[model samples]
Each structure stands twice: as C-alpha cells, then as structure tokens.
Target: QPIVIKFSHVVAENTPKGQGALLFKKLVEQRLGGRVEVDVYPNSSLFGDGKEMEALLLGDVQMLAPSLAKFEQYTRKVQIFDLPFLFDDIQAVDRFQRSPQGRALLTSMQGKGILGLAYWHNGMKQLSANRPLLEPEDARGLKFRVQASDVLNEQFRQLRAISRKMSFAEVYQGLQTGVVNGTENTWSNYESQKVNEVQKYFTESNHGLVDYMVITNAKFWNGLPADIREELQRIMDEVTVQVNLEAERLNRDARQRILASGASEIHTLSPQQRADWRQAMQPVWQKFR
Candidate 1:
C-alpha cells in the first residue's frame, strides 16, 4: 500500500514553508512512484505550527515543518540559535551546520521523539515594533511576542524585554491591539504577516536566522521498513540542499518587493550598530551556555 504523508505550515503557499512543503511533496511522490504520497497544507489549514508539533507527536500528522524558534519549547539548547550574532552570515551558518557540531545538534533531537531532518532557512530575524526601534536598547521593556518556549522566555528576560508566548495565529493581533509591542521573525514571515503595515518600525535585527525542519514522528519512523526509511532520509537531504538555494534567491527578491511596496521602514545595521546588538545579547549565550 502507498503511504500518504500530510505536511503542513502556517504561512502562504508561496512563502518558504509553503513552497518547501510542496517541493517535498512533489519530490517524494515522483521519486517513490505510487508507494508514497504527500499532501501540502498551508496557512494553518490543519493547525498552527505550534499546535502542529503535538499533532505530529500524536501521529495525527506524519510530518511537520515549523521554524526552529518553535523548537525552543521542546529543548533549551535550541534557544542558543535565537541569540543575536549566533552566525556571522549565510556562509558561516552553512559551515557550522556541516561540521561535526552540526551533526551533534541534529542528533540531540532524537531524544525528543521528533527526528531532526534538515534546517531550511527562512531569513534573518528582524524586530517589528509598534514604533521604530532605533536601536537594540530601544527594545527594552517592550512586551515581545515569542514562540512559546522557555529558552525564549530566558532570552527575553536577559534582554530586559517582556516575552509573551503565543501562537503564530495571535501575533498580528497581538501587535495591533497593543497586546504585544514587538516580535521577531524572519523577513519572509515579517512580510507575509504584514507587520510593516500593522507595526510602526522594523529593525533588521537579523539577530538570529530562522530555520525550519522536516520532521517525522520517531515512533512512526522506527516502524517504517528499512528501505522506506533509507529512501525517505535520502530524499530529505536532497530536498534540504535544493530548497536552501531557492530560499536564498527568494529572500533576496522578497526584500525588493517589500521595500518597493513601502511595507515597512527598513533599518539596516551598521558595523557599530551590529556590535551594539552583539553586546546586548551576550548574556543570552552566557545564561544558556
């Protein structure tokens, strides 16, 4: 019998999560012939990303692609990735993940029952505020919406800002009604969520890069026949490399669109400005390390 996979994301079909999920679906269906199938669910059709993890754990869904930010709730180690300057640039990010260190991090997720497959970049992290965030210091005391994760809570506390854990579904309204004054997400999510229209200022914090993974339930994976498991892993790695290249190009194009549309005032970080941010979040590293 052909095995069917249900994959979902909480963003538009064209967005990274959406497009990537579709890519995975297409590749699996085509490569595996009729023995495998995939269904792409975008825009929270089944459940929000935060909630989807539970669905996957329960076997309600076989696969999920959520931003790494969401994994903070499941593992404190994940919070380290959220700290500013965690990576210097795209090349640095790739190098680190390709090292033994990267393999160790991937292996760590096995204990959680959610297999770590690959990290798909969303974009650099940026801050959306009710008013322009002139500098990292300006973020002080603001209630920032964050993925429901203890690591994020600690990171926010160290930054001297209030961290409010909420689902992606609540973030935009959280910004509109003053429930939260600021939040962090990739430029892609920032654009799709249209925070620029709702929030006053955007700081290209890019504090941390956003990464999502294609994960299968550990139990379900273990039950799969050896050949099936091997084939799936092989496909996932191929999809990972191919998708990142596309995401890099897509992110560049999306930035131009965002600026032309006047969606939000873009704030680029100067060398000194980046240094200031680096200093601000050092505590996150110390506290978590």
Candidate 2:
C-alpha cells in the first residue's frame, strides 16, 4: 500500500507557504516513486490554522506548516522567534536558523508529539492603517489586528495601540468594517488577501517576521521505517532551502504588485523612524527574556 501524507495549510496557493507545500508534495511523489503519495490542501481547504495542529496531533493530517507564533500554545519557548525585532534582517534570520540555537528551537516541540522539521520564512511584516504612520506615537489609539500571540499583542500595547487577535481569513473584512483600524503583515498577505484595498496606508517597518514551522506528528515520523525516514529527511532539507529562496523572491514580487494596484500609500521608514519603533518595541523583548 502507498503511504499517504496529507499536507495542509491556511494560505492561498500562490503565497510562499502554500507554494512550498505544493513543491514538497511534488518532490516527495516524484522521488519516492509509488511508495509515497502526497496530497496538499491550501487556503484552509482542509482545515484552518486553529484546527490544523490538533488535526496533526490526532493523525488526521500528516503534515503542516503553521505560523511559528501558533506554536506558543504547545511551548512558550518557541516564542523566542516571535519576539519583535529579534532579527535584524532576512539574512540574520537565515543565519540564526542554521545556527545551534535555531536547530535547538526546532527540537523543542518534540515533547508535544509534533516534530518541527524546518522554519519557512514568509518575510517581514509592515504596518497597514487608514492613516499615515511615520512615528510610533501615530499608532496610539488604533486597533490593530494580529495573530494570537502574546508577544505581538505586547508589541502593539507598547505603542499604545489595542491589539485584537484575529485569524488571517478575517483581516480584510475586519479592516473594511473598522473592526480593526490597522494590522501588520508581509506584502504577500496584503496583496493576496486584497487587504490593501481596505487599508490605504502601509509603512515598511519590517518590525516583525512571519515564519512558519514545517511540522509533522512525532509519532508518525518516528514510526517510519529507517530507510524511508532517512530519504524523507533528505527531501525536507532540499525543500527548506528552496522555500526560503523562493519566499524572498515572492515577497519582492508581492511588494511590486501591491504598489502597482495603487490601492495603498506605501511608506518606507527613515532611519530615525525605524529607531523610534525599535525603541518603543524593545520592552517586548525584555518581557520575553
């Protein structure tokens, strides 16, 4: 019997994570011959992020690449990656992931029956609001939609903004109805979800990074035959490298698309402006420490 691996995620097929999942499916099926089959479901067609992890633990799904912020429920130690401004840039993030600390972070979830295989970058996030946000003080009194992460919540709180935890699927409608006055996200999400249509002001603060942890059920992973597991691990290594590189290019393309749409006024932070934001958000890291 062919081994079936059901991989699921909650993003459009064109987004970085979604594309990576599809690439993985293709590579696995091609290299493993008829012994393995990979079925991929994107945009929450199989399950939303909220239920996907649980589905993996229950063995209802065999693979997932949920946001790293989502892993806090299983272990807060993973929040180290969620800390605002923890990485200076994409290169910095890449270096850290290949370092000893990064490898250790991946293994931290093993005790929870989830095996983190790799970290997939979705690019750094920018702030999208109804009005200009050149200074940290400008964010005060605004309601910002964010993923359900305390670190993210605290980052906005430090700016005197109210952070509302909302799902990715709800962000566009939330912005349109004033359910949220602003939010932070990568360019791909802003463009793919058409959030730029509702929020007219976008500032490239690159304040926080959006990364997903490629994961599988530990029990299933451990139970695989030794030869099959070794080959699968090799394939995962190749997929990780390809996905991160593609993510960088995809985000660049997304930024251009968002600009071409002319739906939002985009702002790149000045040195002083970035410094001010870093200062305001520094406390979030201290709290996590």
Candidate 3:
C-alpha cells in the first residue's frame, strides 16, 4: 500500500496550492509508482493556514505548503521576509536564501519540530484596495485585512491603517461587506479570491516576496524508512526549484490577465513614492530591531 501524504493549503485548486499540489501528486505518484500517494486538501477544507502549523505539529496532517507569513508564527526569524520592501527580485532573494546565512535561517525551524523541505513561490505581494491607494497616507485610517500574525498586525499599524485579522478563506466576503478596505497578497490569490471585483486598486508593491514551503512533521519524517525517506526528500528538493520558476511565470501572466480584464486599475510607485513608504514604516522596523 502507498503511504498517504495529506497536503493542505488555504487557497483554491486554481491558485498556487491547488496547482502545485497536483503537480507534486503527479511527480511523486509517477516516480514512486504508487509506492506513495499525495492527496491535496486545499481552501481550508482540512485546516486553515493559521491552524495548519499546529495541526502539523500534532501530526493531524502529513504535510503543508503555507506561506512564509504563516510559518512566522512558529519561527520568528523567518519574519524578516515579511517586512515590507525587502527583496528586489528573485535574484536578490536567491542570493540571500541560498547563502550560508539563508541556509542557517531555514534550519532554525528544526527547533519547532517541523522539517523544512524546500521553498516554492506564489509571487510577490501586491496592494489591493477599494479605490486607488498610491502612497502611505492613502492607507491611513482604512481597515485592511491581514493574516493572523503579530508581525503583520504591527506592519499594518505602522502604515497607519487598522489591521483586521482573518483567514484567507474569509477575505472575499469580508471585502464585500466593508469589513476590510484593502489587502496585500499575490496576484493569483487576489484574483482567485475574487478581490478585484470588490477592490478597485492594484499596486505592485512587490514589497515583499510571496513564498511557501514544503514541510513535514518531525516525528513522521524521522520514522520513515531510510530509502523511502531519501527518495521522497530528494525529489522535493529538485521539484521546489521547478515549481518556483513555473509560479513566477504564471504570476506574470496573471498580472496581464488582470490588466486586460479592466477589472481594477493597476499602479506602481515611482522610486521616490516608494521611498516615502519606507520612511513612514521605518519606525516599525526600528521598534523590532
């Protein structure tokens, strides 16, 4: 009998989670020839991103591919990636994450009993609003939806907005009801969640990168038969690079689709305008640093 790996995420099948899970399933099942099976449970059907980590610790599910924003709950060091206006591009991120410094940061998760397998990409986060939000002051006083994270809450507050904590599954309705005037997420997520219909502005903050990971329970991973474990882990390592490249391409395509659809107005900050936001949020990082 094949070993069952339950892969869960908070996005729909069309989004990163759904598309990537199926890819993993195909690769694993085909390579292992039924020796292993990957069952994807997306859209919080099994667990929300906030709870998925806890469930993973308890072995309620075999695996998860949550955003780094979600993983920050267990390992605070990873929160560095959550800071707005961090990486400039995939190359910058590649240099940082692949360096000895980056490798060291990833290993820090072991203390929490989760084995970090590899990192994948959804895309860079972009700003979405009920109306065009061109600068830091534009966000002032508006209520924005943020993931349930202290770092995110603090980040939003620094931008002069009220941050409402909510799960990814709840965003669409929350937006429709005036519960949140804006949000920040990747294009695929913003579109797949139908945020464009409810929000009028889209900006390429790309401030922070949007990346997810393949993680497994320490107990389960340690208990796997050595050969089987090596094979599965090895495949995922190579697959992560492939998945990331594909996601990057698709994210670009998603942006063009959104623009052509005329569903929302897209804007990007000039170098000077973006600098203003950095200055505004400077104190937030100072408080943390």
Candidate 4:
C-alpha cells in the first residue's frame, strides 16, 4: 500500500499557506505517486491550535504549517520571530530565513522530535479593533486576541492592552462575540478569516509578521526511506519559494477586498504615529534580547 501523508493546516485553501500545502502534495505525488499519496486538510478540518502538536507527535498527522508562535513549546528562542518590527520588511525577513543562522533554526527542534521544514510567509501584521488604533495611546485599554506567545502578548501589554491567547480557528467568533475587542494579523489573514467583517477598524501597523514553519513529525520523517526524505525536502524547499512569492499577491488582493467590503476602515499610520508605536514596543527587546 502507498504511504499516506497527511498535511493539515489552519487556513483557507486559497491563501499562500493553503496553496503551499497543496503544492507540496502536487510535487510529491507527481514525483513519487506510487510510493506516497498525499492528503491535504485546510481550515482546521484536521486540527487546530489546541491539539495539532499532540496529533503531530502521535503521528496521527504527518505535517503542519503552524505559526512560529506555536514553536515556543519546543524552543523558547523561536519566539524571536514574533518581535515587532524586527526586520525592515518581508525581504529582510526572507534573508534571515535563508541565512545559515536561519536555516540552523529549522533543525533546532529536531531533538524535540519535530522536523522544521520551511518558513512560509503570511505577510506582515496590522492591528484591527472596534475603535481606531492610529495612535499607540488609542489602544490603551482595548482587549486583543493574540497567539499563545509571550512575545506577542507582551507587544499588546506594552500598548496597555489586555492580550487574550486564543485558537486561530476561534478568532472570528471571539471578535464577533466581543471576547476580545481586536487582533493583529496580516491583511490576507484578517480577510480570509472574515475578521474584517466584524472589526470596525484595521490599522496597517506592519509592526510584525505571521509567518509559519512547515513542520512534520520527526520520528515519522526519520522513519521514511532516505531517498523519499531527500525528495520530500526538495519539494518542501520548492514549496517554500512559491509560498513567499504568493504572499504579496494574496495580501494585495485581500487588502483590496477588505477595502471594498466597507465593513471596516483601513488606516495607514503617519510617520510620527508609527514612531510612537515603535518607541512603545522598543523596550520589549530588552526583555527578550
């Protein structure tokens, strides 16, 4: 019987991440059809934040493209990816990912039994809330939903806001139900998950990113035939390149749609406003640096 590889992620099939998963499947099956058959699950049909890692370790699932924030459980240093405005832009971020140090990090958790495959970009983050966050002071008392990462939580905490860690799949409902008054995500993410429809304002902060590392179960990966592993890694690298290229196009389109829907207002910060935000978040570096 052909080996069945299950790739499960928590986004719509239309985005870069979703496309990356499908592309990995396509390339793998095309090259090793009889040896392997791939099954792709999107939008958390397989698992969400709560149990994805559990399932991965048990080999109930073969792959996942989880937020870098999710890796703190395996290696605390991975939280460095969550730092606000850490890079000049996504281009700078790409350089870091492909650099030797960056590549080194991919295998950092191998001993923990998780194989880091590739860095998949979602795009930079923006802040959205029931009220405008044009000025850092404007966010003083708002509640924001954040990933389960101390760095991300600290970012909001610095803004004098309360940060509630929640599942990616539940963010829309949380925003709608007022469980949290706002969230930070890329345009594509907010658009794809329909967060724009519920939140009244979107501040294009570009302060951070929402990238993911395409990871797999290490024991399961190591158990594969050496040749298959080599080919799969090759396919994953190819998929990574495609994902980075697709991120801009998808986010551009998503931004356009979010604007067209009129459910929320998109605001770009003035230079001074952004500097104010940067100042507030700069001290965060000392805590993690």
Off by over 4 Å in 1: none
Q: Report lDDT (Cα) of residue 55, candidate 1.
A: 93
Give me the runs in candidate 3 sitting further than 4 Å from their true place.
Answer: none
- lDDT of candidate 3 at residue 265, scale 0 to 100: 88
TM-scores of the candidates in the order shown: 0.92, 0.97, 0.94, 0.98
Give me the displacement of residue 214 in model 4, in angstroms. 0.9
Q: Kindly give the stretch of ten consecutive residues in candidate 4 with the minimal lDDT sum.
A: 280-289
What tens digits encode model 2's per-residue C-alpha lDDT throughout 204-289?
99888888889999999898888888988888888888889889889889999988988788989888889888888888787787
Residue 260: error of model 3 in Å? 3.3
lDDT of candidate 1 vs native? 0.76
* Model 3: lDDT to the true structure: 0.80
RMSD of each: 1.9, 1.1, 1.7, 1.0
Q: Which candidate order results from sorting by TM-score in descending order?
A: 4, 2, 3, 1
Candidate 3's residue-wise lDDT over 1-289, tens digit each?
A: 8888888888878765577788888888888876889888988999986688888898889888877777665778787777776777766777777788777766678888888777777878888888777887888888889876677788889877999988899998999999898988888888777778888888787766678767889888898889878988778877776776678777777787787778788998898987887777656776567
Best by TM-score: 4
Q: Whole-model Cα lDDT per candidate?
A: 0.76, 0.87, 0.80, 0.89
lDDT of 4 by residue, 139-212 (tens): 99999999999998898888899999999999999988998999999888888898888998988888998889
lDDT of 4: 0.89
* Candidate 2 lDDT score at position 214: 90
